[PDB]
Amino acid sequence: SPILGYWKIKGLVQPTRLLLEYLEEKYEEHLYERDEGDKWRNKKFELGLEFPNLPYYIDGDVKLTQSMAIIRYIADKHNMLGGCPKERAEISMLEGAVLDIRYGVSRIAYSKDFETLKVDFLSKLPEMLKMFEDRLCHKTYLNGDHVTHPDFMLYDALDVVLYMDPMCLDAFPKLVCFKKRIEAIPQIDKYLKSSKYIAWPLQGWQATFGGGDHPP
Amino acid sequence: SPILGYWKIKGLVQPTRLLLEYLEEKYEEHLYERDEGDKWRNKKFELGLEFPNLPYYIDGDVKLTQSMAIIRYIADKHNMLGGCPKERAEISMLEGAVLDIRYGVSRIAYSKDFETLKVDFLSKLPEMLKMFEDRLCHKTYLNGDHVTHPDFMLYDALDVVLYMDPMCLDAFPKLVCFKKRIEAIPQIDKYLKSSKYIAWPLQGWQATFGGGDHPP
Ligand SMILES: O=c1oc2c(O)c(O)cc3c(=O)oc4c(O)c(O)cc1c4c23
Ligand SMILES: N[C@@H](CCC(=O)N[C@@H](CS)C(=O)NCC(=O)O)C(=O)O
Ligand SMILES: N[C@@H](CCC(=O)N[C@@H](CS)C(=O)NCC(=O)O)C(=O)O
Ligand SMILES: [Cl-]
Ligand SMILES: [Cl-]
Ligand code: NA
Ligand code: NA
């Protein structure tokens, strides 16, 4: 079974977990806890990784790091990255537009100045969300009628910004519908209700936003 | 002919420019100068872009944004993204490892405390560069004998960190060699002496590091 290694947090790997659960792929999750930073440091250069980091993905055929390389590899092995340069580029464009939101959060979540930085991020967020709302006015999922890895990336981003402001999706009914649609996929619904789901933290435990042992 | 739209800076699109010149592709670059933000705002939503942003790339088949979608599309049109999931994932892993460096710079380059933040980045930089130095010990380019788009991404990142610290590659002879090897590619050599080459700025003009109209 492939091994997925990461901290016991959502962070960079949550979209990858959602994709694996949608595919019903068996995988072995190797998780590092809040106080296991030393265990990681003693294993980091002992795994055969060319660019040692978390997350990592090991399946015998490959030893990968970089969260986007890993999610794309899993999608690629299941023939989901797109059928021609045009479709593959549309999927990569969706990826990058989601990362603008998700890194917008992570960039400020460890700052002691978070409560002021959050205000600026939430003022810029609507312009980004509007582009996805428009994209979803004619399509069921981000790439049309079938699920692609960016849909799970967007789901993760929406989950995270709703912790920052539970009202930030009120002006975007298509995004509220999209989020409920992902949750209604049978594999996802079972996963999210199960003990396998990691609901918290969103970032590292030391983060000012999305850290700690429990949601506030 | 394809149109590439961006600010008249290196920024997010320099590796794409290098790739297009390496491939000897015909393209038109439409640049926005320091005082042309109004020009961009007047056409941002009139170009048919689904996720309007800079850079944009428009050809007869696609209207793209997101700098990484654009570079991947150009590579994909020339069959350079990788021959199997394993090779495509290694190229994506190299991408992400370069972006760790390049965004490490951009994250701090606009801060008025750049002089203090720089120190931490330059402290982390050697262990990031060491992974590339090791990769080039057994391969000519990052993916082997042939150039891939991550090679031009790495070139761009080395050019930028050398402005931050001229000595930061002194401990990495293979990276010093790699930078000169890219500059020796005849298409790149000619590009660097052409009217199209943008030598400065590295970031937006308003950046504390890599901004202004000329280098320090
Ligand atoms: O601040 C950022 O840090 C990053 C990284 O440190 C990185 O390794 C990759 C990325 C990336 O791919 O996309 C990004 C964005 O679209 C964005 O708006 C901000 C950031 C990043 C980013
Ligand atoms: N660009 C990399 C970033 C990886 C990263 O920053 N990982 C953090 C956790 S979110 C870490 O703890 N890395 C372990 C290390 O550097 O030793 C990716 O997307 O995978
Ligand atoms: N993740 C996006 C970031 C794009 C971005 O931030 N572009 C800046 C310049 S570096 C911009 O000026 N966008 C114009 C706008 O937002 O209207 C990418 O890689 O292309
Ligand atoms: Cl705590
Ligand atoms: Cl100036
Ligand atoms: Na706590
Ligand atoms: Na100046």
Write the layout of secondary structure elements.
Two copies of one chain form a homodimer.
Chain A: E1 3-7, H1 14-23, E2 28-32, H2 37-41, E3 56-58, E4 63-65, H3 67-77, H4 85-109, H5 114-135, H6 149-164, H7 173-184, H8 186-193
Parallel strand pairs in A: 1-2
Antiparallel strand pairs in A: 1-3, 3-4
The structure holds 2,3,7,8-tetrahydroxychromeno[5,4,3-cde]chromene-5,10-dione (REF), glutathione (2 copies), chloride ion (2 copies) and sodium ion (NA) (2 copies).
The site of one chloride ion has 2 residues of chain B, from loops.
Domain GST C-terminal (chains A, B): 84-202
Pfam family, one (chains A, B): GST_C_3
EC number (chains A, B): 2.5.1.18
Overview of this protein structure:
Chain A is of the alpha+beta class. Chain A is about 50% helix and about 5% strand. In chain A, β3 (about 55-60) and β4 form a beta hairpin. The termini of chain A are far apart. Chain A has a 4-stranded mixed β-sheet. Chain A folds into 2 domains: about 1-80 and about 185-210, Glutaredoxin; about 80-185, Glutathione S-transferase Yfyf (Class Pi), Chain A, domain 2, CATH 1.20.1050. Chain A contains 8 helices and 4 strands, in the order βαβαββαααααα. The longest helix of chain A is centred in the middle third of the chain and has 25 residues, at about 85-110. At the A-B interface, α3, α4 and α5 of A face α3, α4 and α5 of B. The structure holds 2,3,7,8-tetrahydroxychromeno[5,4,3-cde]chromene-5,10-dione, glutathione (2 copies), chloride ion (2 copies) and sodium ion (2 copies). 2,3,7,8-tetrahydroxychromeno[5,4,3-cde]chromene-5,10-dione sits at the interface of chains A and B.
